[PDB]
Amino acid sequence: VWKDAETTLFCASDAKAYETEKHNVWATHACVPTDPNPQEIHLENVTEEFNMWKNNMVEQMHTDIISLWDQSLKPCVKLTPLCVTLQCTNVTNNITDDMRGELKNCSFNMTTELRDKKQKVYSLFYRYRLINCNTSAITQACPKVSFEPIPIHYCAPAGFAILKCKDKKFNGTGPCPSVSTVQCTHGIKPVVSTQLLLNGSLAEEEVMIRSENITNNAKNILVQFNTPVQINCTRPNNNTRKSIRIGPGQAFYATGDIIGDIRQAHCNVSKATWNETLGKVVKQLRKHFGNNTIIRFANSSGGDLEVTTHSFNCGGEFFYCNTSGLFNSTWISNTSVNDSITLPCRIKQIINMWQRIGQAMYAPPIQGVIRCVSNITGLILTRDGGSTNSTTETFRPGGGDMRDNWRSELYKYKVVKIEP
Amino acid sequence: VWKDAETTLFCASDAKAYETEKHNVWATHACVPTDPNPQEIHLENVTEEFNMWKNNMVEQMHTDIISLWDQSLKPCVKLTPLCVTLQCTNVTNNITDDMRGELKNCSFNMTTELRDKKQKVYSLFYRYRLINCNTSAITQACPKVSFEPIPIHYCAPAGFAILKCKDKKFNGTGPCPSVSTVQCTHGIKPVVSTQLLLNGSLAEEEVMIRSENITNNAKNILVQFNTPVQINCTRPNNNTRKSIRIGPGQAFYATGDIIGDIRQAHCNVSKATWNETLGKVVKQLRKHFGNNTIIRFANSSGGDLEVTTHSFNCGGEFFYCNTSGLFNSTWISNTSVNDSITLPCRIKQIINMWQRIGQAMYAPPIQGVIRCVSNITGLILTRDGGSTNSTTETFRPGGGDMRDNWRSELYKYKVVKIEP
Amino acid sequence: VWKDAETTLFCASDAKAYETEKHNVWATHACVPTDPNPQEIHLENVTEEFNMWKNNMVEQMHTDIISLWDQSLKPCVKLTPLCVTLQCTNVTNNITDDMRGELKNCSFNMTTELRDKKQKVYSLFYRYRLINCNTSAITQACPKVSFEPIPIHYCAPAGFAILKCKDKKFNGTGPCPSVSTVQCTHGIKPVVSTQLLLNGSLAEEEVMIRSENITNNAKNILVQFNTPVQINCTRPNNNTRKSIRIGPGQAFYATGDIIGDIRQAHCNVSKATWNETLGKVVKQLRKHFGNNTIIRFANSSGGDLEVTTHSFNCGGEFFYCNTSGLFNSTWISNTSVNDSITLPCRIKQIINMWQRIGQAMYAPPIQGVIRCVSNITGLILTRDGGSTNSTTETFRPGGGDMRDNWRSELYKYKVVKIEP
Numbered sequence A, B, C: 001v002w003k004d005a006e007t008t009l010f011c012a013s014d015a016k017a018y019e020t021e022k023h024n025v026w027a028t029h030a031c032v033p034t035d036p037n038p039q040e041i042h043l044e045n046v047t048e049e050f051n052m053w054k055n056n057m058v059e060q061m062h063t064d065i066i067s068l069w070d071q072s073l074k075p076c077v078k079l080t081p082l083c084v085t086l087q088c089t090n091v092t093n094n095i096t097d098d099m100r101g102e103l104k105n106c107s108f109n110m111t112t113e114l115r116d117k118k119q120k121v122y123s124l125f126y127r128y129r130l131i132n133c134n135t136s137a138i139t140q141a142c143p144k145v146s147f148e149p150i151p152i153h154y155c156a157p158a159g160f161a162i163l164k165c166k167d168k169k170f171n172g173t174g175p176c177p178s179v180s181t182v183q184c185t186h187g188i189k190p191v192v193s194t195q196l197l198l199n200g201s202l203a204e205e206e207v208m209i210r211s212e213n214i215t216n217n218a219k220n221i222l223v224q225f226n227t228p229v230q231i232n233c234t235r236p237n238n239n240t241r242k243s244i245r246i247g248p249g250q251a252f253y254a255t256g257d258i259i260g261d262i263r264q265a266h267c268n269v270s271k272a273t274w275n276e277t278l279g280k281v282v283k284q285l286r287k288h289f290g291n292n293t294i295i296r297f298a299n300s301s302g303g304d305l306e307v308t309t310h311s312f313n314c315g316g317e318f319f320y321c322n323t324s325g326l327f328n329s330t331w332i333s334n335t336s337v338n339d340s341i342t343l344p345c346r347i348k349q350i351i352n353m354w355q356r357i358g359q360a361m362y363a364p365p366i367q368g369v370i371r372c373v374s375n376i377t378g379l380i381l382t383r384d385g386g387s388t389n390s391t392t393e394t395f396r397p398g399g400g401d402m403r404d405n406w407r408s409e410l411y412k413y414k415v416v417k418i419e420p
């Protein structure tokens, strides 16, 4: 007897990591070390039926990680008071292109100690007077933290197992020949991004495309790669940490010292991989739903900054990248058709977590010149509903609900229970 | 073996209701649906001894509901800051009877956004300058809530039962012939009122009077009816909801728009029922402790507004009703002796829950013209200690501890445990 | 089978005490009464091996009591706002010795009710204008509390026991002949002090010296006495309680009324006991590690006020005592060698609990003339690393981590588990 769908997930993690960093603090507090036994061991026959996209385990891991995020919001992060009005100026003494600025170094009036005293203080805002924040601001900061995803294992309890499709070619709703039962997963990393999977897991054989409804264009298409497309992101913006402890309740930072004239925040994607991978993707597409069609990739359709750009994190700052460089190639149905692609990005401090309960700020980006090298492990796509007179199919970057990213990770795990 | 008194109560509730309304939110969070099995099934003989007024289950349900009320106090309700001074005026441009006003439309100075800015704002106070609140003010309000009692079932756990006296005529301390054992109650509604039971449960046969000590006038007398006396309460006061979200931490309302000039807030009790019921009550009284006596009913003896009036709620506002109309009849011992009784009521926003930890405000009464039809299911009485030379007995409305209302509801449930 | 080290401790306590006092509130909330059975009963043979200083039970009781202290910090204690600047003066109108003052009666400006009104208010500071507090101030106060250690028993759960060395002469790392197993301890009192144990437990036979590493001078030496050295502490400082409730959120006190000109805060230690005890201690020392050496006792080496003085409490105020009177005797190796010792002490309101999360204030010391008689049950020592050419050994008062005080109390308890 195998019964499914039980919100019960054990956890596993730890080696050299402890506290400080918020991910490390979280894994430390919610996980125990693992054991290198796990045998799974598939048993002969025992079914061919499965459906990864109707897994409530995903929704569990999701709501869990979010609630944990609030549990991190509790102690140090400051929901108040200082955001009122900002006396900002610009570093531009001559100008072209009407740049203005995303980053501004500003002056302020700040409650320090005692009653109603102020001192002149530096403040930076990522996006002149006023302007403030809109109706909420939690400021994370904190003395000892950081933000790098840490491997988290999901295990089944006592009297429970987890079946796992080891079939390389799964239709997602469908015929699976090899079912095994593991007690605990290998350890999943919590990478929060859109459009591409960064870090994550690779396909064992060939590139695999997966959709909950290949006809319904509103449903996402998790495209998993057998190979990584490079992406090196260097944001050489510089900020010097100054945490002025002037008052008991108050804990204020001061960023925006020094110089260096860094261009925005910068990134690259490395293309050879992107050439073969995109060609092979249009190959898979044309060997699935797309039989004879020229495939075109336009950029994001529009929306919130988290939706229009590849919004991901390089350690707690929220990067937004113009994504035209990833999606600007028309793939000819007839046949297939040192330089690297350089993508324009921006660092944000003010992000909107949760629902609107509050905004989250990583206030003192420490040091400067911080490059994050990543492996493009993925694509999340939504199809642009087209016609058949166009003799072409258009595909756009979609996403937003990270639960889709977990289905893209939790695709081979379904918690099940055993009965005599 | 049957051992009693265990603070362990399972709960049951839900059908179409979900969240929003605070009662709905509570039942949703503290209850699971029920099953329409329950068989009770009385067993032949098995005792005649019981005592409803020494039940700690009542004290449990009570403390539970109150703690739950604080659990509702947590998220949205605002204990601070704005109550300081009020710049109020009156709508009276000509006058008789020196009415002044219970309700006032007032002007204020309000922290909106940023640092130390204000804007002119409407404010209403239910009860000229100043005056404020006394040393505490929690303001409930909230975007999605309401307040209507929701059926809550109390069940016994595993290895436990609940004996239930199905005897129609119980002396309260005494001889009960039919004991049954149910797993879960039919579902009790949390009606917070004094003097009368509103909604609640009716007596199966005749009117039943119940007292913990019929000699001790300090002990309450729960008079349960076999029939409901009508009470229709129309408060046609009008208030238009304006919730100005000016600042992140601040959430302010604005009531007191429009007009219609409604007299106070109004109510009615329907009398024919009240005639027969009161006659029958003096009948029961004269067939119990009152053998040969003329029975008179004077109004409340005095005290806090919650004690002098029939303080009940029509959806979160606290109504206070002049109760002379209910208790103004002298019942002659000799024999017995379309018009409806109309009662004067007032709506309050500022109530005192708990102990003095804080006052509770339902700040934006939404809409206007809100009529609540109710069934008078009850009387809670205290006797006026009289003499025997008066050749009369006087009875006054008492109450205050809602636990008495639960004994008036939890009268047929006593949690018990089973042993071999 | 006996396996050790399980963070599981049952608790026991209560007789006549209830709430109010914080210790009473704590024992009331975290303990159930006990039973006067406990039989322990040693069993013949069954080992000689033990090690009291590697007990994680101590660390458990410690972290528990501290977390409980924060749980007391929650409701009434005020982390804010009023500490800004103080307008203080002195009662000295003529002077010798440049005394200044530890205690000052001061004037202030205080938010009372409404918006931005103040009234002239008395304030006392234990340690002229300004000065305030440094970067945190929690103010305890509260309407109904106090602070006197209450006996707390530690018990082993189900399937667990606690072995107990009843050997009078234990080397601490070593050979123990009599092991017994109790379910619950006799009840340990939470005395927070340094250098001396006050209240606490006495040795059954002779004076016993105990060290984790008798060679390592950095390790503490818990010297347990078979007899108490007296210590009577009379602080006849007077303060009159005035709690002005001016505003809803605000709860302010007012101390520093009346007079009496009490000298600081005063104390005594009674010496005859101290004579024999110190002689016997140098006896034990010379019969252990000190074979032929003149033993000298200098005062505290320096540090925070909690480290330099015998920092203990007389009911919630933190006393600091000049400790030269305890350690000023050179003990001749050759042979041994009504007046009472009077020690100078100071009462503090501002103490630093925890880590630096915040300072704790007992704000209104109520009444005046409060004498606490105590039994000196102890010594915590650290050795001054000397030479062998000096032909003398010097010993200094050390301490600070109260866990050492619990090892000094939890010395005969090690929670263990049983297996077939």
Ligand SMILES: *[C@@H]1O[C@H](CO)[C@@H](O[C@@H]2O[C@H](CO)[C@@H](O[C@@H]3O[C@H](CO[C@H]4O[C@H](CO)[C@@H](O)[C@H](O[C@H]5O[C@H](CO)[C@@H](O)[C@H](O)[C@@H]5O[C@H]5O[C@H](CO)[C@@H](O)[C@H](O)[C@@H]5O)[C@@H]4O)[C@@H](O)[C@H](O[C@H]4O[C@H](CO)[C@@H](O)[C@H](O)[C@@H]4O[C@H]4O[C@H](CO)[C@@H](O)[C@H](O)[C@@H]4O[C@H]4O[C@H](CO)[C@@H](O)[C@H](O)[C@@H]4O)[C@@H]3O)[C@H](O)[C@H]2NC(C)=O)[C@H](O)[C@H]1NC(C)=O
Pocket: B232, B233, B234, B267, B268, B339, B340, B341, B342
């Ligand atoms: C608590 O207990 C107390 C008693 O202890 C109860 O107190 C009652 O409170 C209610 C609420 O206010 C009172 O109701 C109002 O009564 C007003 C006076 O009514 C008397 O006089 C009228 C003549 O105007 C008379 O018709 C009434 O008797 C009628 O009803 C009885 C049965 O009850 C019946 O036996 C009679 O035959 C009468 O029925 C005739 O008239 C009816 C209309 O009134 C017709 O429907 C029927 O077919 C027949 O022709 C009674 O003697 C009365 O004026 C008020 O009516 C107003 O306002 C109502 C809203 O509150 C609204 O619904 C009505 O339509 C009406 O509005 C119209 O008229 C007014 C002015 O009359 C205009 O301002 C409006 O603009 C509107 O105009 C329209 O109609 C005009 C005339 O036709 C026309 O010109 C115009 O063009 C428009 O078309 C209220 O009904 C009640 O009086 C109180 N009772 C007592 C004993 O004092 C209370 O019930 C109880 N509470 C509860 C919860 O139970």
Ligand SMILES: *[C@@H]1O[C@H](CO)[C@@H](O[C@@H]2O[C@H](CO)[C@@H](O[C@@H]3O[C@H](CO[C@H]4O[C@H](CO[C@H]5O[C@H](CO)[C@@H](O)[C@H](O)[C@@H]5O)[C@@H](O)[C@H](O[C@H]5O[C@H](CO)[C@@H](O)[C@H](O)[C@@H]5O)[C@@H]4O)[C@@H](O)[C@H](O[C@H]4O[C@H](CO)[C@@H](O)[C@H](O)[C@@H]4O)[C@@H]3O)[C@H](O)[C@H]2NC(C)=O)[C@H](O)[C@H]1NC(C)=O
Pocket: A094, A095, A096
């Ligand atoms: C801070 O202040 C500084 C000054 O202190 C200021 O400096 C400017 O910097 C910018 C960027 O380098 C310069 O912009 C470029 O100007 C080029 C030259 O334009 C002049 O000549 C044009 C014709 O030249 C063509 O043909 C001639 C043969 O005659 C040939 O030799 C040339 O090489 C070239 O082929 C002429 O059209 C132009 O005048 C136009 O505009 C003015 C108004 O500004 C108008 O009045 C005229 O009627 C006419 O429309 C001018 O005289 C220019 O070629 C170049 O344009 C190309 O590149 C841009 C992208 O960069 C394309 O958008 C465009 O389509 C062309 O492909 C570009 O515009 C500018 O010249 C400097 N200003 C001066 C005075 O030197 C900065 O703006 C300030 N900011 C900063 C941070 O530096």
Ligand SMILES: *[C@@H]1O[C@H](CO)[C@@H](O[C@@H]2O[C@H](CO)[C@@H](O[C@@H]3O[C@H](CO[C@H]4O[C@H](CO[C@H]5O[C@H](CO)[C@@H](O)[C@H](O)[C@@H]5O)[C@@H](O)[C@H](O[C@H]5O[C@H](CO)[C@@H](O)[C@H](O)[C@@H]5O)[C@@H]4O)[C@@H](O)[C@H](O[C@H]4O[C@H](CO)[C@@H](O)[C@H](O)[C@@H]4O)[C@@H]3O)[C@H](O)[C@H]2NC(C)=O)[C@H](O)[C@H]1NC(C)=O
Pocket: A236, A237, A238, A239, A240, A241, A257, A258, A259, A260, A367, A368, A369
């Ligand atoms: C953005 O802002 C960030 C800050 O938020 C800023 O960070 C800088 O990062 C760079 C690169 O890592 C640092 O540069 C290095 O600085 C080293 C330390 O220099 C300090 O101390 C010097 C002496 O130190 C010796 O002795 C001290 C004890 O006294 C001991 O602690 C040290 O370990 C060491 O033994 C001192 O001379 C120096 O001050 C010099 O310069 C200042 C002006 O800047 C001048 O006022 C002084 O008079 C003096 O000349 C400073 O106080 C330094 O050792 C090191 O130098 C070696 O390496 C470089 C190559 O990297 C060689 O060129 C050089 O010959 C040496 O071998 C190097 O210079 C810098 O310290 C950080 N700044 C801060 C504030 O921490 C980034 O620069 C900014 N980034 C951008 C993009 O703008």
Ligand SMILES: *[C@@H]1O[C@H](CO)[C@@H](O[C@@H]2O[C@H](CO)[C@@H](O[C@@H]3O[C@H](CO[C@H]4O[C@H](CO[C@H]5O[C@H](CO)[C@@H](O)[C@H](O)[C@@H]5O)[C@@H](O)[C@H](O[C@H]5O[C@H](CO)[C@@H](O)[C@H](O)[C@@H]5O)[C@@H]4O)[C@@H](O)[C@H](O[C@H]4O[C@H](CO)[C@@H](O)[C@H](O)[C@@H]4O)[C@@H]3O)[C@H](O)[C@H]2NC(C)=O)[C@H](O)[C@H]1NC(C)=O
Pocket: B094, B095, B096
């Ligand atoms: C806003 O301002 C307006 C004015 O702009 C003002 O209007 C008043 O409205 C009220 C309520 O309707 C009126 O009060 C009533 O007055 C009745 C008439 O009183 C006059 O006459 C009295 C004797 O009349 C009797 O006999 C005569 C024949 O002589 C006969 O026609 C009558 O029908 C009646 O039978 C007389 O006593 C009285 O004068 C008394 O008071 C004045 C001081 O005010 C004093 O100086 C006199 O010496 C004497 O004591 C007056 O001249 C009156 O009958 C009626 O009283 C009965 O009812 C009330 C309950 O309503 C009972 O309490 C009382 O016991 C009686 O049973 C009542 O008092 C008043 O007349 C209006 N004023 C004017 C100027 O017209 C309002 O006050 C303001 N407020 C609002 C919102 O409207």
Ligand SMILES: *[C@@H]1O[C@H](CO)[C@@H](O[C@@H]2O[C@H](CO)[C@@H](O[C@@H]3O[C@H](CO[C@H]4O[C@H](CO[C@H]5O[C@H](CO)[C@@H](O)[C@H](O)[C@@H]5O)[C@@H](O)[C@H](O[C@H]5O[C@H](CO)[C@@H](O)[C@H](O)[C@@H]5O)[C@@H]4O)[C@@H](O)[C@H](O[C@H]4O[C@H](CO)[C@@H](O)[C@H](O)[C@@H]4O)[C@@H]3O)[C@H](O)[C@H]2NC(C)=O)[C@H](O)[C@H]1NC(C)=O
Pocket: C094, C095, C096
């Ligand atoms: C408030 O104001 C009042 C005034 O209104 C003021 O009162 C002072 O109170 C203090 C404490 O009681 C007094 O201090 C003592 O003074 C003693 C006397 O000193 C005088 O005489 C000294 C010599 O006397 C010796 O020899 C004579 C014979 O000649 C013999 O009879 C005496 O008994 C004694 O043996 C003399 O040296 C001294 O003058 C010295 O100092 C002044 C400066 O002040 C300097 O100019 C001189 O050159 C010289 O150095 C003075 O004339 C004194 O004996 C005593 O000292 C002993 O005790 C202290 C400890 O208390 C030791 O530290 C010291 O080593 C000695 O053992 C002590 O100093 C003082 O006299 C009062 N002042 C007056 C004017 O009467 C307070 O200060 C104010 N405060 C309060 C709260 O009261």
Ligand SMILES: *[C@@H]1O[C@H](CO)[C@@H](O[C@@H]2O[C@H](CO)[C@@H](O[C@@H]3O[C@H](CO[C@H]4O[C@H](CO[C@H]5O[C@H](CO)[C@@H](O)[C@H](O)[C@@H]5O)[C@@H](O)[C@H](O[C@H]5O[C@H](CO)[C@@H](O)[C@H](O)[C@@H]5O)[C@@H]4O)[C@@H](O)[C@H](O[C@H]4O[C@H](CO)[C@@H](O)[C@H](O)[C@@H]4O)[C@@H]3O)[C@H](O)[C@H]2NC(C)=O)[C@H](O)[C@H]1NC(C)=O
Pocket: C236, C237, C238, C239, C240, C241, C257, C258, C259, C260, C367, C368, C369
């Ligand atoms: C430090 O400050 C604290 C305050 O925080 C202060 O505390 C005082 O503690 C002392 C000692 O315990 C108290 O002294 C006692 O006060 C008793 C009460 O006196 C009050 O009431 C008197 C009458 O009371 C009778 O009737 C009332 C009802 O009316 C009833 O409640 C009582 O129980 C009792 O039956 C009243 O006369 C008295 O006022 C007198 O004095 C004031 C000036 O102080 C004057 O203005 C009045 O006109 C009047 O003369 C006061 O209001 C009192 O009964 C008691 O007296 C008996 O015992 C003493 C010996 O102890 C005998 O000498 C005396 O003859 C009586 O037998 C005693 O005096 C005092 O009340 C506390 N103060 C406060 C504010 O509570 C300390 O003094 C300060 N300590 C230091 C070191 O400075």
Ligand SMILES: *[C@@H]1O[C@H](CO)[C@@H](O)[C@H](O)[C@H]1NC(C)=O
Pocket: A213, A214, A215, A216, A217
């Ligand atoms: C998928 O979507 C299409 C419409 O886009 C619909 O026709 C089809 O029935 C859907 N499949 C499922 C399983 O709902």
Ligand SMILES: *[C@@H]1O[C@H](CO)[C@@H](O)[C@H](O)[C@H]1NC(C)=O
Pocket: A230, A231, A232, A268, A269, A270, A271, A340, A341, A373
């Ligand atoms: C970034 O570095 C990796 C190797 O670490 C390389 O494969 C990749 O091509 C680089 N990215 C670009 C755009 O050059």
Ligand SMILES: *[C@@H]1O[C@H](CO)[C@@H](O)[C@H](O)[C@H]1NC(C)=O
Pocket: A299, A300, A308, A322, A323, A324, A325
């Ligand atoms: C990047 O994308 C935006 C829309 O998201 C588009 O308008 C813009 O032209 C693109 N930028 C580049 C460099 O192509």
Ligand SMILES: *[C@@H]1O[C@H](CO)[C@@H](O)[C@H](O)[C@H]1NC(C)=O
Pocket: B108, B109, B118, C115
């Ligand atoms: C607001 O304005 C009123 C006068 O309209 C004044 O009495 C009051 O002091 C003002 N309050 C503030 C916040 O200054």
Ligand SMILES: *[C@@H]1O[C@H](CO)[C@@H](O)[C@H](O)[C@H]1NC(C)=O
Pocket: B213, B214, B215, B216, B217
């Ligand atoms: C009931 O109250 C009366 C006094 O009012 C008293 O005489 C009687 O003993 C009481 N009964 C009980 C059970 O206490």
Ligand SMILES: *[C@@H]1O[C@H](CO)[C@@H](O)[C@H](O)[C@H]1NC(C)=O
Pocket: B299, B300, B308, B309, B322, B323, B324, B325, B344
């Ligand atoms: C209503 O009751 C109050 C006392 O609570 C009494 O003073 C008043 O006279 C009564 N009012 C009416 C309308 O009878």
Ligand SMILES: *[C@@H]1O[C@H](CO)[C@@H](O)[C@H](O)[C@H]1NC(C)=O
Pocket: A115, C087, C108, C109, C118
């Ligand atoms: C309170 O008054 C003092 C002078 O008595 C002054 O120095 C101080 O600034 C005042 N504080 C406030 C709140 O203005």
Ligand SMILES: *[C@@H]1O[C@H](CO)[C@@H](O)[C@H](O)[C@H]1NC(C)=O
Pocket: C213, C214, C215, C216, C217
């Ligand atoms: C005790 O400390 C001394 C150094 O002071 C060292 O020589 C000895 O090895 C230590 N013993 C243990 C058990 O570490």
